Write a protein that binds this ligand. Sequence first.
Ligand SMILES: *[C@@H]1O[C@H](CO)[C@@H](O[C@@H]2O[C@H](CO)[C@@H](O[C@@H]3O[C@H](CO)[C@@H](O)[C@H](O)[C@@H]3O)[C@H](O)[C@H]2NC(C)=O)[C@H](O)[C@H]1NC(C)=O
Ligand SMILES: *[C@@H]1O[C@H](CO)[C@@H](O[C@@H]2O[C@H](CO)[C@@H](O[C@@H]3O[C@H](CO)[C@@H](O)[C@H](O)[C@@H]3O)[C@H](O)[C@H]2NC(C)=O)[C@H](O)[C@H]1NC(C)=O
Ligand SMILES: *[C@@H]1O[C@H](CO)[C@@H](O)[C@H](O)[C@H]1NC(C)=O
Ligand SMILES: *[C@@H]1O[C@H](CO)[C@@H](O)[C@H](O)[C@H]1NC(C)=O
Ligand SMILES: *[C@@H]1O[C@H](CO)[C@@H](O)[C@H](O)[C@H]1NC(C)=O
Ligand SMILES: *[C@@H]1O[C@H](CO)[C@@H](O)[C@H](O)[C@H]1NC(C)=O
Ligand SMILES: *[C@@H]1O[C@H](CO)[C@@H](O)[C@H](O)[C@H]1NC(C)=O
Lengths: 113, 113, 253, 253
Amino acid sequence: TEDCRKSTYPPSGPTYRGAVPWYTINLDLPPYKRWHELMLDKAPMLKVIVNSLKNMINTFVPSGKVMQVVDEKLPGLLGNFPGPFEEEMKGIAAVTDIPLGEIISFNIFYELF
Amino acid sequence: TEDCRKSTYPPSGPTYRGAVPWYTINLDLPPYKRWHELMLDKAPMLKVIVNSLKNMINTFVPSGKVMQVVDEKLPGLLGNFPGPFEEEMKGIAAVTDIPLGEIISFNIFYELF
Amino acid sequence: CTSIVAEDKKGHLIHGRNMDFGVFLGWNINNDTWVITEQLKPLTVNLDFQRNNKTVFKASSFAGYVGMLTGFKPGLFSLTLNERFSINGGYLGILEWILGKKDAMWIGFLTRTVLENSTSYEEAKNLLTKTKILAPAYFILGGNQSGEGCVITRDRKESLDVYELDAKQGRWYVVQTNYDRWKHPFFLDDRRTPAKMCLNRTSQENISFETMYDVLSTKPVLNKLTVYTTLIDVTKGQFETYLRDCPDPCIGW
Amino acid sequence: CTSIVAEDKKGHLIHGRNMDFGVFLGWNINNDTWVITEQLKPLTVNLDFQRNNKTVFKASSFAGYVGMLTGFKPGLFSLTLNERFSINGGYLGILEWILGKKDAMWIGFLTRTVLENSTSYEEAKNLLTKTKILAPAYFILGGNQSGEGCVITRDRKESLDVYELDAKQGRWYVVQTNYDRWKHPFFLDDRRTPAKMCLNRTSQENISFETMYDVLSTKPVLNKLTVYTTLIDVTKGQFETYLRDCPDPCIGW
Ligand SMILES: *[C@@H]1O[C@H](CO)[C@@H](O[C@@H]2O[C@H](CO)[C@@H](O[C@@H]3O[C@H](CO)[C@@H](O)[C@H](O)[C@@H]3O)[C@H](O)[C@H]2NC(C)=O)[C@H](O)[C@H]1NC(C)=O
Ligand SMILES: *[C@@H]1O[C@H](CO)[C@@H](O[C@@H]2O[C@H](CO)[C@@H](O[C@@H]3O[C@H](CO)[C@@H](O)[C@H](O)[C@@H]3O)[C@H](O)[C@H]2NC(C)=O)[C@H](O)[C@H]1NC(C)=O
Ligand SMILES: *[C@@H]1O[C@H](CO)[C@@H](O)[C@H](O)[C@H]1NC(C)=O
Ligand SMILES: *[C@@H]1O[C@H](CO)[C@@H](O)[C@H](O)[C@H]1NC(C)=O
Ligand SMILES: *[C@@H]1O[C@H](CO)[C@@H](O)[C@H](O)[C@H]1NC(C)=O
Ligand SMILES: *[C@@H]1O[C@H](CO)[C@@H](O)[C@H](O)[C@H]1NC(C)=O
Ligand SMILES: *[C@@H]1O[C@H](CO)[C@@H](O)[C@H](O)[C@H]1NC(C)=O
């Protein structure tokens, strides 16, 4: 361990990468449309994770064959989620051009660990 | 499974081997003497279990060398138990001619499983 | 093993339990029995613990075993102990004990300490819930009044759940076998579900020593490992234990 | 992850947490970072969920993740989620889900449902304690009054423990990392013990956004897996999240 840190707030220095931007989600919109604005800005970065996930999967098993199964088989296998999650995730998949099975896997990663 | 059984009490029939005898333990006696009377009556049967344990132990490892360790090393390894148990078990070991390590092993079988 | 604390319409408490134990040494293929189970029967005894010529508590125990697995304190409470299995619970506690950490109690001794020196249902309940123990266990406790019944699922250093009678809500009994109530059983034996089925069929009005013994005589609640059956009534002060047999056809455990 | 609910002498509540996540994809030997952790930083966003131009709740989340791991409902309560590991918890729940048993909620969605539709500290506490979930978890909840803080150690179908603030006992904070309080940590990191040491040195009188951020900036409480740090005050309505870095020398987790 280390001696308890002193005088680190407000955040500055090498342990403060930067501030977090604010976004507004309007629940009055239908679930399919709530995340449209935010996902437009962040679709590229989320694809970086997917590509990075494919490369590591490639070692144990070819990534293509795995993702065909995830994208094609997982949505029907898990069934529908309660609202607004099914439509909220369906909307995120359409806007980001990321398959629904990968959007789902992202949103249930805790259960997957 | 089976239909819930009716008219089984008072106990009789093939599922009732017999009644359980009563013994009185007088806590006013020192712990070392409390089980003297009962252990005199039941020492032979308790030896039957130990003998049966030696036979089964013999399979994995020779029972003799195993029991030397239990009798010689286990009491010192575990240390003393809080009263009245240490003296209660010491008395049971003396009356039954069963080593203390085996009496202890019997009395902590739950933790041992 | 099975432990049941039941409440009749009159709020009267009955505490019954089946003592199942003895697979360790194997199976007698000659008469279809467990070696230890048959050897534990002639060792089973009823014990009247007295101080100054007056009964303190009564118990069912195996001669040579100074801890208490089944007992009651006349007019006060009744306690039975059921085995709880964990990934590595029992042996970590012994390890810390050998290496010098002795602030935890052995399970057989704790229940003995409670039956001997506890004077109330809450005192036992409070001690059974909080005391550090070297291995996980189930404590089934009944009192001298209506509603005083609970199952204490224990970890070595924590009480994961205390399941209490709620006759208003419709919980007139609590049943405990050898698996956590909120989980699932390891095998088919599943003595808990049939125990509840028979407790249900009897209905709260008819729960008694006769109907309780009926529940504990139904397979698989009765099985080849069943050494003895105990029936307890705290307010009446009656405590009786009967050796059992499960002749073929029956089930192993 | 580390979650802390603290209470100053004036009864004011401070809720801080460190979001640690990202070993799954491995380690960047080029700049000593976890692959996912660095990729999660530019995805981190603060979210103002509004209904009729009125803020319902605010959260810190990863863009594309519709469940909530860090958030609060201004003036009502604050909720953070810590990962809890079990032998076979996560997948047994998913399995029953696939076979059609859908009476359990996904962890990310439950915390979202609570932050979105719960109107009080007790309602959230009651739901977080009782609701069936597909995987084990820790829930750290803070309220809008003094003494309203608890850690809910959850099983899929049971609440194993609810650990609450006790100004009487001297418990002005509750800390939760990634191992059950009554057990032991898996590794050396043991971020819980340093958090308590630093929380203790701060003392109840001086706990604030500034000193809370000091605790969450001390190694190993701050570590390479730390994506962001969050500081929350329910009554004031202040909610701040900062991306973090742990430059060498530091620790993996
Ligand atoms: C250690 O090195 C890795 C790469 O070797 C760094 O990861 C990179 O982090 C940056 C942001 O910090 C990512 O940039 C992003 O690019 C996307 C488009 O590609 C853009 O949409 C985002 O807004 C952002 O600019 C970059 O993708 C990411 N690379 C990988 C492979 O994950 C990491 O940050 C380095 N860490 C340190 C402490 O130096
Ligand atoms: C099935 O067969 C086994 C033997 O093959 C039986 O085990 C025996 O059971 C009897 C009574 O249950 C035990 O009797 C005891 O003998 C000792 C001396 O050996 C004596 O000191 C005691 O007072 C008592 O009379 C006997 O020890 C025991 N034998 C062994 C090896 O354990 C078993 O009872 C049979 N079960 C059924 C249901 O037929
Ligand atoms: C019961 O009474 C006292 C402790 O209060 C002590 O003398 C005695 O040993 C106790 N018995 C047990 C079994 O702890
Ligand atoms: C019942 O037990 C309580 C303690 O829980 C005791 O105070 C009371 O005297 C007992 N009453 C009867 C009738 O046994
Ligand atoms: C027993 O009856 C109760 C009714 O209160 C019911 O909920 C439960 O499922 C029943 N259990 C069995 C095993 O019949
Ligand atoms: C919140 O509002 C109602 C339930 O009262 C329901 O229509 C809606 O789906 C709820 N939202 C969530 C996330 O459960
Ligand atoms: C706190 O929660 C209670 C819940 O009943 C609510 O009435 C109150 O407005 C909230 N705010 C404050 C400042 O107490």
